[PDB]
Amino acid sequence: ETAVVFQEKEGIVENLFKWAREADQPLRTYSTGLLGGAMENQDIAANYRDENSQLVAIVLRRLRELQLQEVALRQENKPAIEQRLILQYLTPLGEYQELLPIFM
Amino acid sequence: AYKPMEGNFEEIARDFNPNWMSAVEILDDDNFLGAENAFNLFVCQKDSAATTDEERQHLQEVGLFHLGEFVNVFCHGSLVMQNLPTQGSVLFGTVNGMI
Protein backbone atom coordinates (compact mmCIF):
# COMPACT_ATOMS: atom_id res chain seq x y z
CA GLU A 1 0.00 0.00 0.00
CA THR A 2 2.27 2.81 1.21
CA ALA A 3 4.70 2.17 3.97
CA VAL A 4 6.48 -1.18 3.44
CA VAL A 5 8.95 0.67 1.19
CA PHE A 6 8.68 3.73 3.48
CA GLN A 7 9.23 2.24 6.97
CA GLU A 8 12.50 2.12 8.97
CA LYS A 9 13.30 -0.96 6.87
CA GLU A 10 14.24 1.46 4.10
CA GLY A 11 17.42 -0.16 2.77
CA ILE A 12 15.28 -1.90 0.12
CA VAL A 13 14.99 1.55 -1.47
CA GLU A 14 18.79 1.62 -1.76
CA ASN A 15 19.04 -2.14 -2.30
CA LEU A 16 16.94 -1.97 -5.46
CA PHE A 17 19.61 0.31 -6.93
CA LYS A 18 21.91 -2.64 -6.31
CA TRP A 19 19.07 -4.93 -7.42
CA ALA A 20 18.85 -3.12 -10.75
CA ARG A 21 22.41 -2.10 -11.63
CA GLU A 22 23.90 -5.42 -10.46
CA ALA A 23 21.05 -7.94 -10.34
CA ASP A 24 20.52 -10.95 -12.57
CA GLN A 25 18.47 -10.50 -15.73
CA PRO A 26 15.66 -12.87 -14.58
CA LEU A 27 15.92 -11.06 -11.26
CA ARG A 28 15.83 -7.69 -13.09
CA THR A 29 12.82 -9.11 -14.99
CA TYR A 30 10.68 -8.51 -11.90
CA SER A 31 13.00 -6.12 -10.02
CA THR A 32 11.80 -2.98 -11.75
CA GLY A 33 8.31 -2.47 -10.36
CA LEU A 34 9.42 -3.16 -6.79
CA LEU A 35 10.10 0.57 -6.37
CA GLY A 36 6.59 1.26 -7.67
CA GLY A 37 5.19 1.91 -4.21
CA ALA A 38 8.17 4.17 -3.59
CA MET A 39 7.40 6.19 -6.72
CA GLU A 40 3.67 6.26 -6.03
CA ASN A 41 4.76 7.88 -2.77
CA GLN A 42 5.57 11.57 -2.95
CA ASP A 43 7.94 11.43 0.03
CA ILE A 44 10.42 8.92 -1.39
CA ALA A 45 10.06 10.86 -4.65
CA ALA A 46 11.12 13.84 -2.52
CA ASN A 47 13.71 11.94 -0.46
CA TYR A 48 15.25 10.57 -3.68
CA ARG A 49 14.45 13.29 -6.20
CA ASP A 50 18.08 13.16 -7.39
CA GLU A 51 19.08 9.60 -6.49
CA ASN A 52 16.33 8.20 -8.69
CA SER A 53 17.80 10.29 -11.52
CA GLN A 54 20.72 7.90 -11.41
CA LEU A 55 18.37 4.95 -11.92
CA VAL A 56 16.32 6.62 -14.67
CA ALA A 57 19.52 6.83 -16.73
CA ILE A 58 20.01 3.07 -16.22
CA VAL A 59 16.47 2.00 -17.02
CA LEU A 60 16.05 4.19 -20.10
CA ARG A 61 19.12 2.81 -21.87
CA ARG A 62 17.92 -0.74 -21.26
CA LEU A 63 14.47 0.33 -22.46
CA ARG A 64 15.89 1.49 -25.79
CA GLU A 65 17.53 -1.87 -26.50
CA LEU A 66 14.19 -3.70 -26.59
CA GLN A 67 13.27 -1.99 -29.86
CA LEU A 68 16.65 -3.16 -31.09
CA GLN A 69 15.79 -6.55 -29.59
CA GLU A 70 12.10 -7.21 -30.23
CA VAL A 71 11.50 -5.41 -33.54
CA ALA A 72 14.67 -6.84 -35.10
CA LEU A 73 13.46 -10.27 -34.02
CA ARG A 74 10.23 -9.42 -35.82
CA GLN A 75 12.44 -8.04 -38.62
CA GLU A 76 13.38 -11.56 -39.71
CA ASN A 77 10.41 -12.64 -41.89
CA LYS A 78 9.67 -9.51 -43.93
CA PRO A 79 10.28 -10.82 -22.89
CA ALA A 80 8.61 -7.44 -23.34
CA ILE A 81 6.84 -8.15 -20.06
CA GLU A 82 10.02 -6.63 -18.67
CA GLN A 83 9.40 -3.66 -20.98
CA ARG A 84 5.82 -3.78 -19.74
CA LEU A 85 7.03 -3.61 -16.16
CA ILE A 86 9.92 -1.25 -16.94
CA LEU A 87 7.42 1.41 -18.03
CA GLN A 88 5.47 0.66 -14.85
CA TYR A 89 8.39 2.13 -12.92
CA LEU A 90 8.65 5.32 -14.96
CA THR A 91 4.94 6.17 -14.87
CA PRO A 92 4.62 7.89 -11.43
CA LEU A 93 7.95 9.72 -11.39
CA GLY A 94 7.70 10.86 -15.00
CA GLU A 95 5.35 13.63 -13.88
CA TYR A 96 7.81 15.22 -11.46
CA GLN A 97 10.23 18.02 -12.23
CA GLU A 98 13.98 17.79 -12.94
CA LEU A 99 13.66 14.42 -14.68
CA LEU A 100 12.19 15.89 -17.83
CA PRO A 101 15.75 17.12 -18.77
CA ILE A 102 17.14 13.61 -19.13
CA PHE A 103 13.77 12.59 -20.55
CA MET A 104 14.29 15.11 -23.31
CA ALA B 1 17.07 31.33 -12.35
CA TYR B 2 16.26 30.04 -15.79
CA LYS B 3 17.07 26.43 -16.58
CA PRO B 4 16.63 26.07 -20.36
CA MET B 5 16.83 22.29 -20.19
CA GLU B 6 13.96 22.31 -17.69
CA GLY B 7 11.81 24.76 -19.65
CA ASN B 8 10.80 26.70 -16.54
CA PHE B 9 12.19 29.10 -13.94
CA GLU B 10 13.70 28.33 -10.54
CA GLU B 11 14.15 30.28 -7.32
CA ILE B 12 17.86 30.44 -6.58
CA ALA B 13 17.63 32.77 -3.61
CA ARG B 14 15.74 35.66 -2.04
CA ASP B 15 16.43 38.45 0.40
CA PHE B 16 13.91 38.64 3.21
CA ASN B 17 14.36 42.12 4.69
CA PRO B 18 11.42 44.35 3.63
CA ASN B 19 12.99 47.17 1.64
CA TRP B 20 10.67 49.16 -0.63
CA MET B 21 12.36 49.04 -4.02
CA SER B 22 13.09 51.95 -6.34
CA ALA B 23 15.67 50.57 -8.82
CA VAL B 24 17.81 47.44 -9.17
CA GLU B 25 20.86 46.54 -11.26
CA ILE B 26 23.04 43.43 -11.53
CA LEU B 27 26.71 44.26 -11.02
CA ASP B 28 28.94 41.25 -11.70
CA ASP B 29 26.73 38.08 -11.62
CA ASP B 30 27.51 37.69 -7.90
CA ASN B 31 26.54 41.05 -6.38
CA PHE B 32 23.23 42.85 -6.84
CA LEU B 33 22.63 46.55 -6.20
CA GLY B 34 19.27 47.98 -5.19
CA ALA B 35 17.65 51.29 -4.36
CA GLU B 36 15.10 52.08 -1.69
CA ASN B 37 12.35 54.60 -0.93
CA ALA B 38 14.27 55.46 2.24
CA PHE B 39 16.99 57.06 0.04
CA ASN B 40 19.52 54.28 0.54
CA LEU B 41 21.71 51.80 -1.34
CA PHE B 42 22.70 48.21 -0.57
CA VAL B 43 24.40 45.24 -2.24
CA CYS B 44 23.09 41.69 -1.89
CA GLN B 45 25.25 38.63 -2.56
CA LYS B 46 24.50 35.11 -3.75
CA ASP B 47 25.91 32.93 -1.02
CA SER B 48 28.93 30.63 -1.29
CA ALA B 49 29.04 28.25 1.70
CA ALA B 50 25.90 26.39 0.61
CA THR B 51 26.10 23.77 3.35
CA THR B 52 22.35 23.22 3.19
CA ASP B 53 19.38 24.31 1.12
CA GLU B 54 18.28 26.87 3.70
CA GLU B 55 21.60 28.73 3.83
CA ARG B 56 21.59 29.11 0.04
CA GLN B 57 18.06 30.45 -0.46
CA HIS B 58 18.85 33.46 1.74
CA LEU B 59 20.61 36.40 0.11
CA GLN B 60 22.98 38.29 2.38
CA GLU B 61 23.04 42.09 2.46
CA VAL B 62 26.69 42.99 2.00
CA GLY B 63 27.06 46.74 2.36
CA LEU B 64 24.80 49.63 3.36
CA PHE B 65 24.93 53.31 2.47
CA HIS B 66 22.74 56.42 2.68
CA LEU B 67 22.98 58.09 -0.69
CA GLY B 68 20.56 60.75 0.45
CA GLU B 69 18.69 60.89 -2.84
CA PHE B 70 15.99 58.91 -4.62
CA VAL B 71 17.43 56.63 -7.32
CA ASN B 72 15.19 56.13 -10.34
CA VAL B 73 17.44 54.67 -13.02
CA PHE B 74 20.53 52.53 -13.30
CA CYS B 75 22.55 51.99 -16.46
CA HIS B 76 25.90 50.65 -17.61
CA GLY B 77 28.48 52.51 -19.64
CA SER B 78 31.15 55.02 -18.72
CA LEU B 79 31.28 58.64 -19.79
CA VAL B 80 35.04 58.70 -20.39
CA MET B 81 37.27 57.45 -23.18
CA GLN B 82 38.10 53.77 -23.54
CA ASN B 83 41.90 54.01 -23.59
CA LEU B 84 42.38 50.36 -24.65
CA PRO B 85 41.93 50.98 -11.54
CA THR B 86 38.37 49.94 -10.81
CA GLN B 87 36.11 47.42 -12.54
CA GLY B 88 32.84 48.23 -14.25
CA SER B 89 30.81 51.44 -14.18
CA VAL B 90 27.21 52.01 -13.11
CA LEU B 91 25.63 55.44 -13.44
CA PHE B 92 22.30 56.28 -11.87
CA GLY B 93 19.54 58.81 -12.40
CA THR B 94 17.67 60.54 -9.61
CA VAL B 95 14.87 63.00 -8.82
CA ASN B 96 17.15 65.97 -8.21
CA GLY B 97 19.39 65.74 -11.26
CA MET B 98 22.24 64.08 -9.37
CA ILE B 99 24.10 61.66 -11.60
PDB file of C-alpha atoms in Angstrom:
ATOM      1  CA  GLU A   1       0.000   0.000   0.000  1.00  0.00           C
ATOM      2  CA  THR A   2       2.266   2.806   1.210  1.00  0.00           C
ATOM      3  CA  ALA A   3       4.705   2.165   3.973  1.00  0.00           C
ATOM      4  CA  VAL A   4       6.484  -1.175   3.435  1.00  0.00           C
ATOM      5  CA  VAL A   5       8.947   0.667   1.191  1.00  0.00           C
ATOM      6  CA  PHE A   6       8.683   3.733   3.481  1.00  0.00           C
ATOM      7  CA  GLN A   7       9.225   2.237   6.968  1.00  0.00           C
ATOM      8  CA  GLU A   8      12.503   2.119   8.971  1.00  0.00           C
ATOM      9  CA  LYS A   9      13.304  -0.957   6.873  1.00  0.00           C
ATOM     10  CA  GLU A  10      14.237   1.457   4.095  1.00  0.00           C
ATOM     11  CA  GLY A  11      17.415  -0.163   2.765  1.00  0.00           C
ATOM     12  CA  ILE A  12      15.276  -1.895   0.123  1.00  0.00           C
ATOM     13  CA  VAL A  13      14.993   1.551  -1.470  1.00  0.00           C
ATOM     14  CA  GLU A  14      18.789   1.622  -1.761  1.00  0.00           C
ATOM     15  CA  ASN A  15      19.040  -2.144  -2.299  1.00  0.00           C
ATOM     16  CA  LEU A  16      16.943  -1.968  -5.464  1.00  0.00           C
ATOM     17  CA  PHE A  17      19.608   0.310  -6.926  1.00  0.00           C
ATOM     18  CA  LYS A  18      21.914  -2.638  -6.306  1.00  0.00           C
ATOM     19  CA  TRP A  19      19.073  -4.930  -7.417  1.00  0.00           C
ATOM     20  CA  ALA A  20      18.855  -3.115 -10.749  1.00  0.00           C
ATOM     21  CA  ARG A  21      22.414  -2.098 -11.628  1.00  0.00           C
ATOM     22  CA  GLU A  22      23.897  -5.416 -10.462  1.00  0.00           C
ATOM     23  CA  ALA A  23      21.046  -7.943 -10.342  1.00  0.00           C
ATOM     24  CA  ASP A  24      20.518 -10.955 -12.575  1.00  0.00           C
ATOM     25  CA  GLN A  25      18.465 -10.498 -15.733  1.00  0.00           C
ATOM     26  CA  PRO A  26      15.659 -12.867 -14.584  1.00  0.00           C
ATOM     27  CA  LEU A  27      15.922 -11.058 -11.265  1.00  0.00           C
ATOM     28  CA  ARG A  28      15.834  -7.689 -13.088  1.00  0.00           C
ATOM     29  CA  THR A  29      12.821  -9.108 -14.989  1.00  0.00           C
ATOM     30  CA  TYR A  30      10.680  -8.510 -11.895  1.00  0.00           C
ATOM     31  CA  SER A  31      12.996  -6.117 -10.021  1.00  0.00           C
ATOM     32  CA  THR A  32      11.799  -2.978 -11.755  1.00  0.00           C
ATOM     33  CA  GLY A  33       8.309  -2.473 -10.365  1.00  0.00           C
ATOM     34  CA  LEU A  34       9.421  -3.162  -6.791  1.00  0.00           C
ATOM     35  CA  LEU A  35      10.095   0.573  -6.368  1.00  0.00           C
ATOM     36  CA  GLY A  36       6.591   1.260  -7.672  1.00  0.00           C
ATOM     37  CA  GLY A  37       5.189   1.914  -4.213  1.00  0.00           C
ATOM     38  CA  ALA A  38       8.171   4.172  -3.588  1.00  0.00           C
ATOM     39  CA  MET A  39       7.404   6.191  -6.722  1.00  0.00           C
ATOM     40  CA  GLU A  40       3.665   6.262  -6.030  1.00  0.00           C
ATOM     41  CA  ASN A  41       4.755   7.878  -2.767  1.00  0.00           C
ATOM     42  CA  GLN A  42       5.568  11.568  -2.949  1.00  0.00           C
ATOM     43  CA  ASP A  43       7.939  11.433   0.034  1.00  0.00           C
ATOM     44  CA  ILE A  44      10.421   8.917  -1.391  1.00  0.00           C
ATOM     45  CA  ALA A  45      10.065  10.857  -4.647  1.00  0.00           C
ATOM     46  CA  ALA A  46      11.121  13.845  -2.518  1.00  0.00           C
ATOM     47  CA  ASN A  47      13.705  11.935  -0.457  1.00  0.00           C
ATOM     48  CA  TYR A  48      15.247  10.572  -3.681  1.00  0.00           C
ATOM     49  CA  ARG A  49      14.450  13.291  -6.204  1.00  0.00           C
ATOM     50  CA  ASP A  50      18.081  13.158  -7.390  1.00  0.00           C
ATOM     51  CA  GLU A  51      19.085   9.600  -6.489  1.00  0.00           C
ATOM     52  CA  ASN A  52      16.328   8.204  -8.694  1.00  0.00           C
ATOM     53  CA  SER A  53      17.796  10.290 -11.520  1.00  0.00           C
ATOM     54  CA  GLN A  54      20.721   7.903 -11.412  1.00  0.00           C
ATOM     55  CA  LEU A  55      18.369   4.951 -11.920  1.00  0.00           C
ATOM     56  CA  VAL A  56      16.323   6.620 -14.666  1.00  0.00           C
ATOM     57  CA  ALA A  57      19.516   6.827 -16.725  1.00  0.00           C
ATOM     58  CA  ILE A  58      20.010   3.073 -16.218  1.00  0.00           C
ATOM     59  CA  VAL A  59      16.471   2.001 -17.021  1.00  0.00           C
ATOM     60  CA  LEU A  60      16.048   4.191 -20.101  1.00  0.00           C
ATOM     61  CA  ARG A  61      19.117   2.815 -21.874  1.00  0.00           C
ATOM     62  CA  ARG A  62      17.916  -0.736 -21.255  1.00  0.00           C
ATOM     63  CA  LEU A  63      14.465   0.334 -22.455  1.00  0.00           C
ATOM     64  CA  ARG A  64      15.887   1.486 -25.790  1.00  0.00           C
ATOM     65  CA  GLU A  65      17.535  -1.871 -26.502  1.00  0.00           C
ATOM     66  CA  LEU A  66      14.191  -3.704 -26.593  1.00  0.00           C
ATOM     67  CA  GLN A  67      13.274  -1.993 -29.857  1.00  0.00           C
ATOM     68  CA  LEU A  68      16.648  -3.156 -31.087  1.00  0.00           C
ATOM     69  CA  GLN A  69      15.788  -6.549 -29.592  1.00  0.00           C
ATOM     70  CA  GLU A  70      12.104  -7.207 -30.226  1.00  0.00           C
ATOM     71  CA  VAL A  71      11.501  -5.408 -33.535  1.00  0.00           C
ATOM     72  CA  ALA A  72      14.668  -6.835 -35.101  1.00  0.00           C
ATOM     73  CA  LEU A  73      13.462 -10.275 -34.024  1.00  0.00           C
ATOM     74  CA  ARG A  74      10.229  -9.424 -35.820  1.00  0.00           C
ATOM     75  CA  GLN A  75      12.441  -8.040 -38.621  1.00  0.00           C
ATOM     76  CA  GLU A  76      13.379 -11.564 -39.706  1.00  0.00           C
ATOM     77  CA  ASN A  77      10.407 -12.637 -41.890  1.00  0.00           C
ATOM     78  CA  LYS A  78       9.675  -9.510 -43.932  1.00  0.00           C
ATOM     79  CA  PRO A  79      10.283 -10.816 -22.886  1.00  0.00           C
ATOM     80  CA  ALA A  80       8.605  -7.439 -23.338  1.00  0.00           C
ATOM     81  CA  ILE A  81       6.836  -8.146 -20.056  1.00  0.00           C
ATOM     82  CA  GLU A  82      10.025  -6.632 -18.671  1.00  0.00           C
ATOM     83  CA  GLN A  83       9.402  -3.657 -20.975  1.00  0.00           C
ATOM     84  CA  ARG A  84       5.819  -3.777 -19.739  1.00  0.00           C
ATOM     85  CA  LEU A  85       7.027  -3.611 -16.155  1.00  0.00           C
ATOM     86  CA  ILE A  86       9.923  -1.248 -16.937  1.00  0.00           C
ATOM     87  CA  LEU A  87       7.423   1.405 -18.029  1.00  0.00           C
ATOM     88  CA  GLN A  88       5.469   0.661 -14.849  1.00  0.00           C
ATOM     89  CA  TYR A  89       8.393   2.128 -12.916  1.00  0.00           C
ATOM     90  CA  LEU A  90       8.653   5.321 -14.958  1.00  0.00           C
ATOM     91  CA  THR A  91       4.945   6.173 -14.868  1.00  0.00           C
ATOM     92  CA  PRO A  92       4.623   7.889 -11.433  1.00  0.00           C
ATOM     93  CA  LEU A  93       7.947   9.719 -11.389  1.00  0.00           C
ATOM     94  CA  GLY A  94       7.704  10.860 -15.004  1.00  0.00           C
ATOM     95  CA  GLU A  95       5.345  13.629 -13.883  1.00  0.00           C
ATOM     96  CA  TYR A  96       7.811  15.219 -11.457  1.00  0.00           C
ATOM     97  CA  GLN A  97      10.229  18.023 -12.228  1.00  0.00           C
ATOM     98  CA  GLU A  98      13.976  17.792 -12.935  1.00  0.00           C
ATOM     99  CA  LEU A  99      13.661  14.419 -14.683  1.00  0.00           C
ATOM    100  CA  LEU A 100      12.194  15.891 -17.827  1.00  0.00           C
ATOM    101  CA  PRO A 101      15.745  17.122 -18.775  1.00  0.00           C
ATOM    102  CA  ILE A 102      17.140  13.610 -19.126  1.00  0.00           C
ATOM    103  CA  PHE A 103      13.772  12.587 -20.553  1.00  0.00           C
ATOM    104  CA  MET A 104      14.292  15.112 -23.307  1.00  0.00           C
TER     105      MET A 104
ATOM    106  CA  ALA B   1      17.072  31.326 -12.350  1.00  0.00           C
ATOM    107  CA  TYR B   2      16.258  30.039 -15.787  1.00  0.00           C
ATOM    108  CA  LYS B   3      17.070  26.428 -16.578  1.00  0.00           C
ATOM    109  CA  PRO B   4      16.635  26.072 -20.359  1.00  0.00           C
ATOM    110  CA  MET B   5      16.834  22.287 -20.195  1.00  0.00           C
ATOM    111  CA  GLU B   6      13.963  22.308 -17.688  1.00  0.00           C
ATOM    112  CA  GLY B   7      11.809  24.758 -19.652  1.00  0.00           C
ATOM    113  CA  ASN B   8      10.798  26.703 -16.536  1.00  0.00           C
ATOM    114  CA  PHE B   9      12.186  29.104 -13.935  1.00  0.00           C
ATOM    115  CA  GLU B  10      13.705  28.333 -10.537  1.00  0.00           C
ATOM    116  CA  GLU B  11      14.153  30.276  -7.320  1.00  0.00           C
ATOM    117  CA  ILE B  12      17.859  30.437  -6.581  1.00  0.00           C
ATOM    118  CA  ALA B  13      17.632  32.774  -3.609  1.00  0.00           C
ATOM    119  CA  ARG B  14      15.740  35.659  -2.043  1.00  0.00           C
ATOM    120  CA  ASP B  15      16.432  38.450   0.397  1.00  0.00           C
ATOM    121  CA  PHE B  16      13.907  38.639   3.207  1.00  0.00           C
ATOM    122  CA  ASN B  17      14.363  42.118   4.689  1.00  0.00           C
ATOM    123  CA  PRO B  18      11.418  44.351   3.628  1.00  0.00           C
ATOM    124  CA  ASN B  19      12.986  47.170   1.642  1.00  0.00           C
ATOM    125  CA  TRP B  20      10.675  49.158  -0.626  1.00  0.00           C
ATOM    126  CA  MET B  21      12.361  49.040  -4.019  1.00  0.00           C
ATOM    127  CA  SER B  22      13.086  51.946  -6.344  1.00  0.00           C
ATOM    128  CA  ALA B  23      15.674  50.570  -8.822  1.00  0.00           C
ATOM    129  CA  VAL B  24      17.815  47.436  -9.169  1.00  0.00           C
ATOM    130  CA  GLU B  25      20.864  46.539 -11.259  1.00  0.00           C
ATOM    131  CA  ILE B  26      23.045  43.431 -11.531  1.00  0.00           C
ATOM    132  CA  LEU B  27      26.709  44.259 -11.016  1.00  0.00           C
ATOM    133  CA  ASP B  28      28.938  41.252 -11.700  1.00  0.00           C
ATOM    134  CA  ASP B  29      26.730  38.085 -11.623  1.00  0.00           C
ATOM    135  CA  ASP B  30      27.511  37.694  -7.903  1.00  0.00           C
ATOM    136  CA  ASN B  31      26.538  41.051  -6.384  1.00  0.00           C
ATOM    137  CA  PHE B  32      23.225  42.846  -6.838  1.00  0.00           C
ATOM    138  CA  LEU B  33      22.627  46.548  -6.204  1.00  0.00           C
ATOM    139  CA  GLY B  34      19.269  47.976  -5.192  1.00  0.00           C
ATOM    140  CA  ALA B  35      17.650  51.295  -4.363  1.00  0.00           C
ATOM    141  CA  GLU B  36      15.103  52.084  -1.686  1.00  0.00           C
ATOM    142  CA  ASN B  37      12.345  54.601  -0.929  1.00  0.00           C
ATOM    143  CA  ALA B  38      14.269  55.464   2.241  1.00  0.00           C
ATOM    144  CA  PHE B  39      16.989  57.062   0.039  1.00  0.00           C
ATOM    145  CA  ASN B  40      19.523  54.275   0.535  1.00  0.00           C
ATOM    146  CA  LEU B  41      21.710  51.798  -1.340  1.00  0.00           C
ATOM    147  CA  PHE B  42      22.697  48.215  -0.570  1.00  0.00           C
ATOM    148  CA  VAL B  43      24.399  45.242  -2.240  1.00  0.00           C
ATOM    149  CA  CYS B  44      23.085  41.691  -1.885  1.00  0.00           C
ATOM    150  CA  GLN B  45      25.248  38.634  -2.557  1.00  0.00           C
ATOM    151  CA  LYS B  46      24.504  35.110  -3.746  1.00  0.00           C
ATOM    152  CA  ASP B  47      25.913  32.930  -1.016  1.00  0.00           C
ATOM    153  CA  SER B  48      28.934  30.631  -1.291  1.00  0.00           C
ATOM    154  CA  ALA B  49      29.036  28.248   1.705  1.00  0.00           C
ATOM    155  CA  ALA B  50      25.903  26.386   0.605  1.00  0.00           C
ATOM    156  CA  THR B  51      26.103  23.771   3.348  1.00  0.00           C
ATOM    157  CA  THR B  52      22.350  23.225   3.188  1.00  0.00           C
ATOM    158  CA  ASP B  53      19.378  24.308   1.122  1.00  0.00           C
ATOM    159  CA  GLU B  54      18.277  26.875   3.702  1.00  0.00           C
ATOM    160  CA  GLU B  55      21.598  28.730   3.831  1.00  0.00           C
ATOM    161  CA  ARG B  56      21.586  29.106   0.038  1.00  0.00           C
ATOM    162  CA  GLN B  57      18.060  30.447  -0.464  1.00  0.00           C
ATOM    163  CA  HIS B  58      18.853  33.460   1.736  1.00  0.00           C
ATOM    164  CA  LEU B  59      20.606  36.395   0.107  1.00  0.00           C
ATOM    165  CA  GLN B  60      22.979  38.291   2.375  1.00  0.00           C
ATOM    166  CA  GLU B  61      23.045  42.086   2.464  1.00  0.00           C
ATOM    167  CA  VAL B  62      26.695  42.993   2.004  1.00  0.00           C
ATOM    168  CA  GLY B  63      27.056  46.742   2.362  1.00  0.00           C
ATOM    169  CA  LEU B  64      24.799  49.634   3.356  1.00  0.00           C
ATOM    170  CA  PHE B  65      24.926  53.310   2.472  1.00  0.00           C
ATOM    171  CA  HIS B  66      22.740  56.416   2.676  1.00  0.00           C
ATOM    172  CA  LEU B  67      22.980  58.087  -0.689  1.00  0.00           C
ATOM    173  CA  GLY B  68      20.563  60.750   0.453  1.00  0.00           C
ATOM    174  CA  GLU B  69      18.687  60.893  -2.836  1.00  0.00           C
ATOM    175  CA  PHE B  70      15.991  58.909  -4.625  1.00  0.00           C
ATOM    176  CA  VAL B  71      17.431  56.630  -7.316  1.00  0.00           C
ATOM    177  CA  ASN B  72      15.190  56.126 -10.336  1.00  0.00           C
ATOM    178  CA  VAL B  73      17.436  54.670 -13.022  1.00  0.00           C
ATOM    179  CA  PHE B  74      20.531  52.533 -13.303  1.00  0.00           C
ATOM    180  CA  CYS B  75      22.552  51.985 -16.459  1.00  0.00           C
ATOM    181  CA  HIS B  76      25.898  50.649 -17.614  1.00  0.00           C
ATOM    182  CA  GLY B  77      28.482  52.513 -19.636  1.00  0.00           C
ATOM    183  CA  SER B  78      31.154  55.017 -18.720  1.00  0.00           C
ATOM    184  CA  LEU B  79      31.280  58.643 -19.793  1.00  0.00           C
ATOM    185  CA  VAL B  80      35.040  58.703 -20.386  1.00  0.00           C
ATOM    186  CA  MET B  81      37.267  57.452 -23.185  1.00  0.00           C
ATOM    187  CA  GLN B  82      38.101  53.770 -23.545  1.00  0.00           C
ATOM    188  CA  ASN B  83      41.900  54.006 -23.585  1.00  0.00           C
ATOM    189  CA  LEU B  84      42.382  50.365 -24.651  1.00  0.00           C
ATOM    190  CA  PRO B  85      41.929  50.980 -11.541  1.00  0.00           C
ATOM    191  CA  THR B  86      38.368  49.941 -10.805  1.00  0.00           C
ATOM    192  CA  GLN B  87      36.115  47.419 -12.536  1.00  0.00           C
ATOM    193  CA  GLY B  88      32.839  48.230 -14.249  1.00  0.00           C
ATOM    194  CA  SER B  89      30.815  51.441 -14.175  1.00  0.00           C
ATOM    195  CA  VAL B  90      27.210  52.006 -13.109  1.00  0.00           C
ATOM    196  CA  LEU B  91      25.633  55.438 -13.436  1.00  0.00           C
ATOM    197  CA  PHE B  92      22.298  56.279 -11.868  1.00  0.00           C
ATOM    198  CA  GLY B  93      19.542  58.814 -12.400  1.00  0.00           C
ATOM    199  CA  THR B  94      17.675  60.542  -9.609  1.00  0.00           C
ATOM    200  CA  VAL B  95      14.871  62.995  -8.821  1.00  0.00           C
ATOM    201  CA  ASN B  96      17.148  65.970  -8.214  1.00  0.00           C
ATOM    202  CA  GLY B  97      19.392  65.742 -11.260  1.00  0.00           C
ATOM    203  CA  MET B  98      22.236  64.078  -9.370  1.00  0.00           C
ATOM    204  CA  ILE B  99      24.102  61.659 -11.595  1.00  0.00           C
TER     205      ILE B  99
END
